[PDB]
Protein backbone atom coordinates (compact mmCIF):
# COMPACT_ATOMS: atom_id res chain seq x y z
CA UNK A 1 0.00 0.00 0.00
CA UNK A 2 2.92 2.31 0.74
CA UNK A 3 4.57 1.63 -2.62
CA UNK A 4 1.33 2.47 -4.43
CA UNK A 5 1.37 6.01 -3.02
CA UNK A 6 5.15 6.27 -3.40
CA UNK A 7 4.86 5.61 -7.13
CA UNK A 8 2.21 8.36 -7.40
CA UNK A 9 4.56 10.72 -5.54
CA UNK A 10 7.39 9.81 -7.93
CA UNK A 11 5.11 10.27 -10.96
CA UNK A 12 3.95 13.67 -9.68
CA UNK A 13 7.19 15.12 -11.04
CA UNK A 14 6.70 13.04 -14.20
CA UNK A 15 3.71 13.07 -16.55
CA UNK A 16 1.06 10.34 -16.31
CA UNK A 17 -2.09 12.36 -17.01
CA UNK A 18 -3.87 9.50 -18.80
CA UNK A 19 -1.61 6.74 -17.42
CA UNK A 20 -2.33 6.92 -13.66
CA UNK A 21 -6.01 6.08 -14.33
CA UNK A 22 -5.41 2.34 -13.87
CA UNK A 23 -4.22 2.94 -10.30
CA UNK A 24 -7.42 4.73 -9.20
CA UNK A 25 -10.24 3.17 -11.25
CA UNK A 26 -11.90 0.43 -9.16
CA UNK A 27 -9.64 1.27 -6.22
CA UNK A 28 -10.56 1.42 -2.53
CA UNK A 29 -11.97 4.48 -0.75
CA UNK A 30 -10.65 4.43 2.83
CA UNK A 31 -7.08 5.15 1.63
CA UNK A 32 -8.01 8.58 0.21
CA UNK A 33 -6.57 10.48 3.17
CA UNK A 34 -3.29 8.56 2.80
CA UNK A 35 -3.03 8.71 -1.01
CA UNK A 36 -4.13 12.31 -1.60
CA UNK A 37 -2.80 13.26 1.83
CA UNK A 38 0.58 11.67 1.14
CA UNK A 39 3.08 13.89 2.93
CA UNK A 40 6.31 12.16 1.98
CA UNK A 41 9.87 13.43 1.50
CA UNK A 42 11.77 12.77 -1.74
CA UNK A 43 15.21 13.59 -0.39
CA UNK A 44 13.96 15.37 2.73
CA UNK A 45 11.17 17.73 1.63
CA UNK A 46 7.95 17.35 3.66
CA UNK A 47 5.45 17.70 0.84
CA UNK A 48 2.53 16.30 -1.15
CA UNK A 49 2.36 15.38 -4.86
CA UNK A 50 0.54 18.68 -5.45
CA UNK A 51 3.22 20.63 -3.56
CA UNK A 52 6.07 19.10 -5.55
CA UNK A 53 4.02 19.60 -8.73
CA UNK A 54 3.67 23.32 -7.97
CA UNK A 55 7.33 23.56 -6.95
CA UNK A 56 8.51 21.88 -10.17
CA UNK A 57 5.90 23.68 -12.29
CA UNK A 58 3.22 21.06 -12.97
CA UNK A 59 -0.22 22.66 -13.05
CA UNK A 60 -1.37 19.65 -15.09
CA UNK A 61 -0.60 17.40 -12.12
CA UNK A 62 -2.63 19.78 -9.92
CA UNK A 63 -5.53 19.44 -12.35
CA UNK A 64 -4.93 15.66 -12.25
CA UNK A 65 -5.32 15.69 -8.46
CA UNK A 66 -8.46 17.80 -8.97
CA UNK A 67 -9.84 15.86 -11.95
CA UNK A 68 -12.81 14.11 -10.31
CA UNK A 69 -11.99 14.85 -6.66
CA UNK A 70 -10.33 17.44 -4.42
CA UNK A 71 -7.34 17.45 -2.05
CA UNK A 72 -6.46 19.79 0.79
CA UNK A 73 -3.19 21.49 -0.14
CA UNK A 74 -2.45 23.97 2.67
CA UNK A 75 0.11 21.99 4.68
CA UNK A 76 3.32 22.87 6.49
CA UNK A 77 6.66 21.47 5.40
CA UNK A 78 10.38 22.11 5.01
CA UNK A 79 11.01 22.40 1.27
CA UNK A 80 14.60 22.57 -0.02
CA UNK A 81 14.20 25.24 -2.68
CA UNK A 82 16.94 25.91 -5.23
CA UNK A 83 19.82 27.19 -3.13
CA UNK A 84 18.55 26.65 0.42
CA UNK A 85 15.98 24.99 2.67
CA UNK A 86 12.89 26.75 4.03
CA UNK A 87 10.86 25.45 6.97
CA UNK A 88 7.10 25.86 7.17
CA UNK A 89 6.52 26.06 3.42
CA UNK A 90 3.19 25.31 1.74
CA UNK A 91 1.79 24.73 -1.74
CA UNK A 92 0.96 28.38 -2.42
CA UNK A 93 4.32 29.48 -0.99
CA UNK A 94 6.27 27.08 -3.21
CA UNK A 95 4.18 27.93 -6.28
CA UNK A 96 4.86 31.63 -5.69
CA UNK A 97 8.57 31.07 -5.04
CA UNK A 98 9.10 29.23 -8.33
CA UNK A 99 7.61 32.02 -10.47
CA UNK A 100 4.59 30.11 -11.80
CA UNK A 101 1.73 32.59 -12.19
CA UNK A 102 -0.73 30.04 -13.61
CA UNK A 103 -0.12 27.59 -10.75
CA UNK A 104 -0.53 30.40 -8.21
CA UNK A 105 -3.83 31.48 -9.78
CA UNK A 106 -5.00 27.85 -9.85
CA UNK A 107 -4.19 27.45 -6.15
CA UNK A 108 -5.95 30.72 -5.28
CA UNK A 109 -9.06 29.85 -7.32
CA UNK A 110 -9.23 26.35 -5.83
CA UNK A 111 -8.65 27.77 -2.34
CA UNK A 112 -5.29 28.44 -0.70
CA UNK A 113 -4.09 30.57 2.20
CA UNK A 114 -2.67 33.80 0.77
CA UNK A 115 -1.23 34.68 4.20
CA UNK A 116 0.17 31.24 5.07
CA UNK A 117 3.19 32.43 7.03
CA UNK A 118 6.00 29.92 7.45
CA UNK A 119 7.91 29.07 10.63
CA UNK A 120 10.02 32.14 9.83
CA UNK A 121 6.76 34.15 9.52
CA UNK A 122 7.27 34.57 5.77
CA UNK A 123 4.31 35.58 3.61
CA UNK A 124 3.78 34.08 0.13
CA UNK A 125 3.92 37.63 -1.28
CA UNK A 126 7.57 38.18 -0.34
CA UNK A 127 8.31 34.59 -1.39
CA UNK A 128 7.09 35.48 -4.87
CA UNK A 129 8.84 38.87 -4.67
CA UNK A 130 12.22 37.19 -4.12
CA UNK A 131 11.99 36.27 -7.81
CA UNK A 132 9.23 38.78 -8.34
CA UNK A 133 7.30 39.24 -11.56
CA UNK A 134 4.57 41.81 -12.17
CA UNK A 135 1.97 39.35 -13.48
CA UNK A 136 2.47 36.90 -10.61
CA UNK A 137 2.07 39.60 -7.94
CA UNK A 138 -0.97 41.32 -9.56
CA UNK A 139 -3.51 38.77 -8.36
CA UNK A 140 -1.55 38.08 -5.16
CA UNK A 141 -2.02 41.67 -4.02
CA UNK A 142 -5.55 41.62 -5.46
CA UNK A 143 -6.46 38.71 -3.14
CA UNK A 144 -6.68 41.17 -0.19
CA UNK A 145 -3.30 39.92 1.06
CA UNK A 146 -1.71 42.62 3.20
CA UNK A 147 1.73 43.75 2.02
CA UNK A 148 2.49 45.34 5.41
CA UNK A 149 2.85 41.99 7.20
CA UNK A 150 6.23 41.79 8.94
CA UNK A 151 8.76 38.93 8.98
CA UNK A 152 10.97 37.09 11.45
CA UNK A 153 13.59 39.80 10.83
CA UNK A 154 10.98 42.33 9.60
CA UNK A 155 12.03 41.93 5.96
CA UNK A 156 8.84 43.07 4.25
CA UNK A 157 8.00 42.60 0.58
CA UNK A 158 9.28 46.08 -0.32
CA UNK A 159 12.70 45.55 1.28
CA UNK A 160 13.45 42.22 -0.40
CA UNK A 161 11.96 43.41 -3.70
CA UNK A 162 14.26 46.44 -3.62
CA UNK A 163 17.22 44.23 -2.73
CA UNK A 164 16.61 41.68 -5.50
CA UNK A 165 16.45 44.06 -8.49
CA UNK A 166 12.68 44.02 -9.00
CA UNK A 167 11.86 47.56 -10.14
CA UNK A 168 8.51 46.41 -11.55
CA UNK A 169 7.64 44.78 -8.22
CA UNK A 170 8.59 47.82 -6.15
CA UNK A 171 6.69 50.03 -8.60
CA UNK A 172 3.53 47.96 -8.18
CA UNK A 173 4.11 48.01 -4.41
CA UNK A 174 4.55 51.75 -3.87
CA UNK A 175 1.87 52.63 -6.42
CA UNK A 176 -0.58 50.70 -4.20
CA UNK A 177 0.13 52.71 -1.01
CA UNK A 178 2.73 50.50 0.64
CA UNK A 179 4.86 51.46 3.64
CA UNK A 180 7.73 53.78 2.61
CA UNK A 181 9.48 54.23 5.96
CA UNK A 182 9.25 50.61 7.09
CA UNK A 183 11.77 49.63 9.75
CA UNK A 184 13.53 46.28 9.58
CA UNK A 185 14.81 44.48 12.67
CA UNK A 186 18.35 45.42 11.64
CA UNK A 187 17.24 49.05 11.31
CA UNK A 188 17.49 49.47 7.54
CA UNK A 189 14.54 51.18 5.86
CA UNK A 190 14.37 49.67 2.34
CA UNK A 191 16.78 52.27 0.96
CA UNK A 192 19.83 50.57 2.45
CA UNK A 193 18.80 47.37 0.68
CA UNK A 194 18.08 49.39 -2.46
CA UNK A 195 21.54 50.97 -2.20
CA UNK A 196 23.23 47.69 -1.22
CA UNK A 197 22.76 46.11 -4.66
CA UNK A 198 23.36 49.30 -6.66
CA UNK A 199 19.94 49.43 -8.35
CA UNK A 200 19.68 52.99 -9.63
CA UNK A 201 16.09 52.73 -10.89
CA UNK A 202 14.87 51.24 -7.60
CA UNK A 203 16.36 54.13 -5.62
CA UNK A 204 14.89 56.50 -8.22
CA UNK A 205 11.39 55.10 -7.71
CA UNK A 206 11.70 55.06 -3.91
CA UNK A 207 12.88 58.68 -3.71
CA UNK A 208 10.11 59.48 -6.21
CA UNK A 209 7.55 58.11 -3.73
CA UNK A 210 9.10 60.09 -0.83
CA UNK A 211 11.20 57.41 0.85
CA UNK A 212 13.32 60.02 2.75
CA UNK A 213 16.70 59.43 4.40
CA UNK A 214 16.86 57.99 7.92
CA UNK A 215 19.79 56.36 9.70
CA UNK A 216 19.61 52.58 10.08
CA UNK A 217 20.26 50.68 13.29
CA UNK A 218 24.02 50.48 12.79
CA UNK A 219 24.56 54.25 12.77
CA UNK A 220 24.87 54.60 8.99
CA UNK A 221 22.87 56.75 6.60
CA UNK A 222 21.59 55.13 3.38
CA UNK A 223 24.07 57.31 1.49
CA UNK A 224 26.91 55.94 3.62
CA UNK A 225 25.67 52.38 3.02
CA UNK A 226 25.68 53.10 -0.72
CA UNK A 227 29.23 54.42 -0.44
CA UNK A 228 30.22 51.38 1.65
CA UNK A 229 29.41 48.81 -1.05
CA UNK A 230 31.50 50.53 -3.76
CA UNK A 231 28.40 51.65 -5.69
CA UNK A 232 28.65 54.99 -7.47
CA UNK A 233 25.46 55.89 -9.35
CA UNK A 234 23.25 55.53 -6.27
CA UNK A 235 25.79 57.64 -4.36
CA UNK A 236 25.48 60.38 -6.99
CA UNK A 237 21.68 60.21 -6.81
CA UNK A 238 21.65 60.30 -3.00
CA UNK A 239 24.02 63.26 -3.04
CA UNK A 240 21.49 64.83 -5.42
CA UNK A 241 18.77 64.35 -2.77
CA UNK A 242 18.68 68.19 -2.29
CA UNK A 243 18.64 67.67 1.51
CA UNK A 244 22.04 66.22 2.36
CA UNK A 245 24.05 69.09 3.95
CA UNK A 246 27.83 69.19 3.36
CA UNK A 247 29.56 67.28 6.18
CA UNK A 248 27.71 64.13 5.16
CA UNK A 249 28.64 64.83 1.53
CA UNK A 250 32.40 65.01 2.09
CA UNK A 251 32.38 62.02 4.44
CA UNK A 252 30.37 60.06 1.86
CA UNK A 253 32.88 60.93 -0.87
CA UNK A 254 35.79 59.88 1.33
CA UNK A 255 33.98 56.64 2.17
CA UNK A 256 33.35 56.02 -1.54
CA UNK A 257 37.05 56.36 -2.29
CA UNK A 258 37.84 54.11 0.68
CA UNK A 259 35.47 51.42 -0.56
CA UNK A 260 36.91 51.65 -4.07
CA UNK A 261 40.36 51.10 -2.54
CA UNK A 262 39.77 47.56 -1.21
CA UNK A 263 37.10 45.32 -2.75
CA UNK A 264 37.58 42.49 -5.24
CA UNK A 265 34.37 43.08 -7.21
CA UNK A 266 35.12 46.80 -7.68
CA UNK A 267 38.86 47.50 -7.41
CA UNK A 268 40.28 50.68 -8.92
CA UNK A 269 43.12 52.76 -7.55
CA UNK A 270 42.69 55.65 -9.98
CA UNK A 271 39.04 55.93 -8.94
CA UNK A 272 40.12 55.82 -5.29
CA UNK A 273 42.63 58.62 -5.72
CA UNK A 274 40.22 60.70 -7.80
CA UNK A 275 37.36 60.30 -5.31
CA UNK A 276 39.59 61.18 -2.36
CA UNK A 277 40.97 64.14 -4.31
CA UNK A 278 37.46 65.34 -5.13
CA UNK A 279 36.70 65.06 -1.42
CA UNK A 280 39.79 67.11 -0.61
CA UNK A 281 38.98 69.81 -3.17
CA UNK A 282 35.31 70.15 -2.28
CA UNK A 283 36.34 70.05 1.38
CA UNK A 284 38.55 73.15 1.02
CA UNK A 285 36.05 74.87 -1.24
CA UNK A 286 35.98 78.31 0.42
CA UNK A 287 39.24 78.95 2.28
CA UNK A 288 37.35 80.44 5.18
CA UNK A 289 35.09 77.94 6.97
CA UNK A 290 37.57 75.28 5.90
CA UNK A 291 36.38 71.80 6.90
CA UNK A 292 39.57 70.66 8.61
CA UNK A 293 39.58 66.89 8.99
CA UNK A 294 39.33 65.47 12.48
CA UNK A 295 41.81 62.58 12.40
CA UNK A 296 42.00 59.64 14.76
CA UNK A 297 45.52 58.97 16.05
CA UNK A 298 47.68 56.72 13.86
CA UNK A 299 47.25 52.96 14.22
CA UNK A 300 50.22 50.63 13.77
CA UNK A 301 48.21 48.22 11.59
CA UNK A 302 47.91 50.61 8.62
CA UNK A 303 51.59 51.45 8.79
CA UNK A 304 51.84 54.86 10.41
CA UNK A 305 49.91 57.10 8.02
CA UNK A 306 47.65 59.81 9.45
CA UNK A 307 45.12 60.30 6.61
CA UNK A 308 45.69 63.46 4.57
CA UNK A 309 44.52 66.83 5.90
CA UNK A 310 46.06 68.76 2.98
CA UNK A 311 45.92 68.65 -0.83
CA UNK A 312 49.71 68.51 -1.14
CA UNK A 313 49.99 65.31 0.89
CA UNK A 314 47.18 63.66 -1.05
CA UNK A 315 49.10 64.61 -4.19
CA UNK A 316 52.24 63.06 -2.70
CA UNK A 317 50.65 59.60 -2.36
CA UNK A 318 49.09 59.62 -5.84
CA UNK A 319 51.40 57.16 -7.59
CA UNK A 320 52.07 54.83 -4.64
CA UNK A 321 49.45 52.08 -4.73
CA UNK A 322 50.06 50.52 -1.31
CA UNK A 323 50.12 53.97 0.29
CA UNK A 324 46.69 54.54 -1.23
CA UNK A 325 45.53 51.14 0.05
CA UNK A 326 46.53 52.14 3.58
CA UNK A 327 44.97 55.59 3.12
CA UNK A 328 41.68 54.07 1.98
CA UNK A 329 41.70 51.68 4.93
CA UNK A 330 42.30 54.57 7.34
CA UNK A 331 39.53 56.80 5.99
CA UNK A 332 37.17 53.81 5.95
CA UNK A 333 38.06 53.15 9.59
CA UNK A 334 37.47 56.79 10.51
CA UNK A 335 34.10 57.05 8.75
CA UNK A 336 32.54 53.65 9.44
CA UNK A 337 34.01 53.43 12.95
CA UNK A 338 35.57 50.47 14.72
CA UNK A 339 32.17 49.09 15.77
CA UNK A 340 30.86 48.56 12.23
CA UNK A 341 30.27 45.04 10.95
CA UNK A 342 31.41 45.58 7.34
CA UNK A 343 34.57 47.54 8.22
CA UNK A 344 36.75 44.45 8.80
CA UNK A 345 36.17 42.98 5.32
CA UNK A 346 38.53 45.34 3.41
CA UNK A 347 41.15 44.88 6.13
CA UNK A 348 40.91 41.11 5.68
CA UNK A 349 41.11 41.47 1.90
CA UNK A 350 44.15 43.76 2.08
CA UNK A 351 45.84 41.33 4.45
CA UNK A 352 45.06 38.57 1.96
CA UNK A 353 46.59 40.55 -0.90
CA UNK A 354 49.71 41.23 1.17
CA UNK A 355 49.87 37.51 1.99
CA UNK A 356 49.71 36.67 -1.71
CA UNK A 357 52.57 39.12 -2.37
CA UNK A 358 54.77 37.38 0.26
CA UNK A 359 54.71 40.38 2.63
CA UNK A 360 53.50 38.51 5.70
CA UNK A 361 54.40 41.02 8.42
CA UNK A 362 51.97 43.68 7.20
CA UNK A 363 49.50 40.87 6.53
CA UNK A 364 49.80 39.77 10.16
CA UNK A 365 49.35 43.34 11.40
CA UNK A 366 46.26 43.99 9.27
CA UNK A 367 44.68 40.64 10.10
CA UNK A 368 45.31 41.19 13.81
CA UNK A 369 43.54 44.55 13.56
CA UNK A 370 40.64 42.92 11.71
CA UNK A 371 40.45 40.11 14.27
CA UNK A 372 40.41 42.61 17.15
CA UNK A 373 37.64 44.60 15.47
CA UNK A 374 35.59 41.47 14.78
CA UNK A 375 36.09 40.16 18.33
CA UNK A 376 35.03 43.46 19.88
CA UNK A 377 31.88 43.08 17.78
CA UNK A 378 31.41 39.56 19.22
CA UNK A 379 30.92 37.76 15.90
CA UNK A 380 31.66 34.33 14.43
CA UNK A 381 35.40 34.63 13.81
CA UNK A 382 36.34 30.96 13.38
CA UNK A 383 37.08 31.55 9.69
CA UNK A 384 39.45 34.37 10.65
CA UNK A 385 41.27 32.17 13.17
CA UNK A 386 41.59 29.44 10.54
CA UNK A 387 43.01 32.08 8.19
CA UNK A 388 45.53 33.00 10.89
CA UNK A 389 46.52 29.35 11.25
CA UNK A 390 46.89 29.05 7.48
CA UNK A 391 49.08 32.14 7.13
CA UNK A 392 51.25 31.11 10.09
CA UNK A 393 51.66 27.65 8.56
CA UNK A 394 52.65 29.22 5.25
CA UNK A 395 55.15 31.43 7.10
CA UNK A 396 56.67 28.34 8.72
CA UNK A 397 56.65 26.34 5.47
CA UNK A 398 58.75 28.98 3.70
CA UNK A 399 61.16 28.84 6.69
CA UNK A 400 60.21 32.43 7.56
CA UNK A 401 60.40 33.54 11.18
CA UNK A 402 57.08 34.14 12.93
CA UNK A 403 56.90 36.87 15.55
CA UNK A 404 55.94 35.43 18.94
CA UNK A 405 53.73 38.38 20.11
CA UNK A 406 51.56 37.83 17.03
CA UNK A 407 51.02 34.21 18.04
CA UNK A 408 50.29 35.37 21.59
CA UNK A 409 47.68 37.85 20.34
CA UNK A 410 45.95 35.33 18.09
CA UNK A 411 46.03 32.75 20.91
CA UNK A 412 44.36 35.22 23.27
CA UNK A 413 41.71 35.91 20.63
CA UNK A 414 41.14 32.19 20.02
CA UNK A 415 40.83 31.47 23.76
CA UNK A 416 38.30 34.28 24.17
CA UNK A 417 36.34 33.14 21.12
CA UNK A 418 36.26 29.56 22.42
CA UNK A 419 34.89 30.97 25.69
CA UNK A 420 32.04 32.70 23.86
CA UNK A 421 31.60 29.57 21.72
CA UNK A 422 31.03 27.57 24.91
CA UNK A 423 28.57 30.24 26.04
CA UNK A 424 26.71 30.04 22.72
CA UNK A 425 26.64 26.23 22.83
CA UNK A 426 25.22 26.31 26.36
CA UNK A 427 22.65 28.96 25.40
CA UNK A 428 21.50 27.40 22.12
CA UNK A 429 19.29 24.35 22.67
CA UNK A 430 18.10 23.21 19.23
CA UNK A 431 17.82 26.23 16.89
CA UNK A 432 21.33 26.00 15.40
CA UNK A 433 22.98 23.63 17.87
CA UNK A 434 24.64 21.72 15.02
CA UNK A 435 26.13 24.94 13.63
CA UNK A 436 27.31 25.96 17.11
CA UNK A 437 28.96 22.57 17.66
CA UNK A 438 30.61 22.77 14.23
CA UNK A 439 31.98 26.22 15.07
CA UNK A 440 33.18 24.99 18.48
CA UNK A 441 34.95 21.97 16.96
CA UNK A 442 36.60 23.98 14.19
CA UNK A 443 37.65 26.62 16.72
CA UNK A 444 39.30 23.94 18.85
CA UNK A 445 41.04 22.72 15.70
CA UNK A 446 42.26 26.25 14.93
CA UNK A 447 43.56 26.65 18.48
CA UNK A 448 45.48 23.39 18.17
CA UNK A 449 46.89 24.51 14.81
CA UNK A 450 48.06 27.72 16.48
CA UNK A 451 49.62 25.74 19.34
CA UNK A 452 51.42 23.45 16.88
CA UNK A 453 52.72 26.50 15.02
CA UNK A 454 53.82 28.07 18.32
CA UNK A 455 55.85 24.95 19.10
CA UNK A 456 57.85 25.41 15.89
CA UNK A 457 58.48 29.15 16.40
CA UNK A 458 61.48 30.31 18.39
CA UNK A 459 60.39 32.29 21.45
CA UNK A 460 62.12 33.89 24.42
CA UNK A 461 61.36 33.16 28.07
CA UNK A 462 58.71 35.89 28.33
CA UNK A 463 57.04 35.05 25.01
CA UNK A 464 56.90 31.33 25.81
CA UNK A 465 55.62 32.22 29.29
CA UNK A 466 52.76 34.25 27.80
CA UNK A 467 51.92 31.52 25.27
CA UNK A 468 51.98 28.88 28.02
CA UNK A 469 49.76 31.15 30.12
CA UNK A 470 47.23 31.20 27.28
CA UNK A 471 47.42 27.42 26.90
CA UNK A 472 47.05 26.97 30.67
CA UNK A 473 44.01 29.27 30.64
CA UNK A 474 42.35 27.25 27.89
CA UNK A 475 43.12 23.94 29.63
CA UNK A 476 41.49 25.13 32.83
CA UNK A 477 38.10 25.35 31.01
CA UNK A 478 38.44 21.74 29.71
CA UNK A 479 37.06 22.21 26.17
CA UNK A 480 35.37 19.18 24.65
CA UNK A 481 34.10 18.27 21.19
CA UNK A 482 31.03 16.26 20.14
CA UNK A 483 32.46 12.84 20.98
CA UNK A 484 33.93 13.94 24.30
CA UNK A 485 37.38 14.70 22.89
CA UNK A 486 39.29 16.95 25.26
CA UNK A 487 42.04 19.24 24.02
CA UNK A 488 44.64 16.54 24.67
CA UNK A 489 42.68 13.86 22.80
CA UNK A 490 42.50 15.89 19.58
CA UNK A 491 46.26 16.52 19.60
CA UNK A 492 46.78 12.82 20.29
CA UNK A 493 44.29 11.62 17.67
CA UNK A 494 45.47 10.95 14.13
CA UNK A 495 41.83 11.31 13.04
CA UNK A 496 41.81 14.99 14.04
CA UNK A 497 40.87 16.94 10.90
CA UNK A 498 43.61 18.94 9.21
CA UNK A 499 42.71 21.84 6.93
CA UNK A 500 43.37 21.05 3.27
CA UNK A 501 45.33 24.30 2.83
CA UNK A 502 48.94 25.02 3.88
CA UNK A 503 48.35 23.75 7.45
CA UNK A 504 49.07 20.31 5.96
CA UNK A 505 52.66 21.49 5.55
CA UNK A 506 53.05 22.26 9.26
CA UNK A 507 50.36 20.96 11.61
CA UNK A 508 50.09 17.17 11.40
CA UNK A 509 48.37 15.20 14.10
CA UNK A 510 49.45 13.24 16.15
CA UNK A 511 52.14 15.80 17.02
CA UNK A 512 54.50 15.04 19.89
CA UNK A 513 55.45 18.66 20.55
CA UNK A 514 51.81 19.70 21.04
CA UNK A 515 51.26 16.92 23.57
CA UNK A 516 54.49 17.77 25.40
CA UNK A 517 53.47 21.43 25.60
CA UNK A 518 49.93 20.59 26.73
CA UNK A 519 51.10 18.18 29.44
CA UNK A 520 53.72 20.71 30.53
CA UNK A 521 50.86 23.24 30.75
CA UNK A 522 48.81 21.01 33.05
CA UNK A 523 46.44 19.03 30.85
CA UNK A 524 44.16 16.50 32.52
CA UNK A 525 46.11 13.44 31.42
CA UNK A 526 43.47 10.94 32.60
CA UNK A 527 40.58 12.63 30.78
CA UNK A 528 38.18 10.45 28.80
CA UNK A 529 35.80 10.98 25.90
CA UNK A 530 32.22 9.82 25.35
CA UNK A 531 33.60 6.58 23.90
CA UNK A 532 35.57 6.20 27.14
CA UNK A 533 39.03 6.23 25.59
CA UNK A 534 41.75 8.14 27.41
CA UNK A 535 44.69 9.78 25.65
CA UNK A 536 46.64 6.52 25.85
CA UNK A 537 43.98 4.48 24.04
CA UNK A 538 43.89 7.00 21.21
CA UNK A 539 47.66 7.11 20.86
CA UNK A 540 48.12 3.33 20.90
CA UNK A 541 45.46 3.06 18.17
CA UNK A 542 47.76 5.06 15.88
CA UNK A 543 48.02 3.09 12.65
CA UNK A 544 51.46 4.47 11.66
CA UNK A 545 54.10 3.15 14.08
CA UNK A 546 57.05 3.17 11.67
CA UNK A 547 56.61 6.34 9.58
CA UNK A 548 56.83 8.65 12.62
CA UNK A 549 58.16 6.27 15.28
CA UNK A 550 60.06 9.14 16.92
CA UNK A 551 56.82 11.10 17.30
CA UNK A 552 55.04 8.05 18.72
CA UNK A 553 57.81 7.32 21.21
CA UNK A 554 58.01 10.94 22.35
CA UNK A 555 54.25 11.23 22.85
CA UNK A 556 54.00 7.88 24.66
CA UNK A 557 56.88 8.86 26.96
CA UNK A 558 55.20 12.21 27.60
CA UNK A 559 51.82 10.67 28.40
CA UNK A 560 53.34 8.04 30.70
CA UNK A 561 55.51 10.57 32.54
CA UNK A 562 52.52 12.89 32.94
CA UNK A 563 50.98 10.15 35.08
CA UNK A 564 48.19 8.50 33.09
CA UNK A 565 47.38 4.93 34.02
CA UNK A 566 48.69 2.36 31.57
CA UNK A 567 45.72 0.21 32.62
CA UNK A 568 42.47 2.21 32.58
CA UNK A 569 39.63 0.86 30.46
CA UNK A 570 37.23 2.51 28.04
CA UNK A 571 33.45 2.11 27.83
CA UNK A 572 33.94 -1.22 26.04
CA UNK A 573 36.00 -2.59 28.99
CA UNK A 574 39.16 -2.93 26.91
CA UNK A 575 42.63 -2.42 28.33
CA UNK A 576 44.66 -0.27 25.89
CA UNK A 577 47.06 -3.20 25.51
CA UNK A 578 44.10 -5.06 24.02
CA UNK A 579 43.42 -1.93 21.93
CA UNK A 580 47.02 -1.41 20.80
CA UNK A 581 46.33 -2.93 17.32
CA UNK A 582 50.08 -2.70 16.65
CA UNK A 583 53.05 -4.79 17.71
CA UNK A 584 55.36 -1.79 17.98
CA UNK A 585 53.02 0.29 20.13
CA UNK A 586 52.25 -2.74 22.31
CA UNK A 587 55.96 -3.39 22.88
CA UNK A 588 56.59 0.28 23.73
CA UNK A 589 53.69 0.48 26.17
CA UNK A 590 54.61 -2.82 27.84
CA UNK A 591 58.11 -1.40 28.24
CA UNK A 592 56.63 1.70 29.89
CA UNK A 593 54.09 -0.16 32.06
CA UNK A 594 55.04 0.32 35.71
CA UNK A 595 53.92 -2.78 37.59
CA UNK A 596 51.74 -2.19 40.63
CA UNK A 597 49.77 -4.53 42.88
CA UNK A 598 46.90 -2.03 43.00
CA UNK A 599 46.14 -2.33 39.29
CA UNK A 600 46.42 -6.12 39.47
CA UNK A 601 43.94 -6.35 42.34
CA UNK A 602 41.53 -3.93 40.66
CA UNK A 603 41.66 -5.82 37.38
CA UNK A 604 41.09 -9.10 39.24
CA UNK A 605 38.01 -7.60 40.90
CA UNK A 606 36.71 -6.37 37.54
CA UNK A 607 37.38 -9.72 35.84
CA UNK A 608 35.63 -11.75 38.52
CA UNK A 609 32.90 -9.04 38.57
CA UNK A 610 32.69 -9.00 42.36
CA UNK A 611 29.93 -6.74 43.70
CA UNK A 612 31.98 -3.81 45.00
CA UNK A 613 29.31 -1.11 45.33
CA UNK A 614 29.07 0.17 48.93
CA UNK A 615 31.89 -2.16 50.03
CA UNK A 616 35.16 -0.34 49.21
CA UNK A 617 36.50 3.21 49.65
CA UNK A 618 34.92 5.71 47.27
CA UNK A 619 38.20 6.77 45.66
CA UNK A 620 39.11 3.10 45.36
CA UNK A 621 35.54 2.54 44.14
CA UNK A 622 36.31 4.86 41.21
CA UNK A 623 39.75 3.23 40.85
CA UNK A 624 38.16 -0.16 40.24
CA UNK A 625 35.59 1.77 38.22
CA UNK A 626 38.06 2.39 35.43
CA UNK A 627 40.43 -0.52 36.02
Amino acid sequence: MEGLAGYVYKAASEGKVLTLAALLLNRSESDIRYLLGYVSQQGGQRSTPLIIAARNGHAKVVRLLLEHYRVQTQQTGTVRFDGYVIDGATALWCAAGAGHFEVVKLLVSHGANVNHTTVTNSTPLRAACFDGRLDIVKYLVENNANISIANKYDNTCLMIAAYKGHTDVVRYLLEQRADPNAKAHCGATALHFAAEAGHIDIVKELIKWRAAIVVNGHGMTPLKVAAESCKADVVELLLSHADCDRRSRIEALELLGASFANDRENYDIIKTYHYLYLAMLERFQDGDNILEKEVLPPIHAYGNRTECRNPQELESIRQDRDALHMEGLIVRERILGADNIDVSHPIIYRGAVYADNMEFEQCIKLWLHALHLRQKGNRNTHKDLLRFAQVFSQMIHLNETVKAPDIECVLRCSVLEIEQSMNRVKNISDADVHNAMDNYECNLYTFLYLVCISTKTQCSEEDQCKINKQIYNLIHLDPRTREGFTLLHLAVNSNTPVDDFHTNDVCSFPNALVTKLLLDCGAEVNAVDNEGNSALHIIVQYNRPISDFLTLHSIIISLVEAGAHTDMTNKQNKTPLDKSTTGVSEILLKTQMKMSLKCLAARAVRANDINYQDQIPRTLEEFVGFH
Binding site: F130, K383, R387
Partner: peptide, 23 residues
Protein backbone atom coordinates in the same frame (compact mmCIF):
# COMPACT_ATOMS: atom_id res chain seq x y z
CA UNK B 1 37.28 28.16 -4.09
CA UNK B 2 38.33 29.15 -0.57
CA UNK B 3 41.88 27.80 -0.92
CA UNK B 4 43.43 31.13 -1.96
CA UNK B 5 44.05 33.53 0.92
CA UNK B 6 41.40 35.87 -0.58
CA UNK B 7 38.61 36.20 2.01
CA UNK B 8 36.10 33.33 2.10
CA UNK B 9 33.37 35.88 2.75
CA UNK B 10 32.15 37.52 -0.45
CA UNK B 11 31.61 40.93 1.14
CA UNK B 12 29.68 39.61 4.13
CA UNK B 13 26.95 42.21 3.68
CA UNK B 14 24.29 40.14 5.45
CA UNK B 15 24.38 42.59 8.38
CA UNK B 16 21.42 44.75 7.42
CA UNK B 17 19.65 42.23 5.11
CA UNK B 18 19.07 38.78 6.53
CA UNK B 19 18.97 37.04 3.15
CA UNK B 20 15.54 35.56 2.54
CA UNK B 21 15.42 31.85 1.58
CA UNK B 22 18.93 31.42 3.07
CA UNK B 23 19.63 29.37 6.19
Amino acid sequence: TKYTFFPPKKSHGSCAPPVSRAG
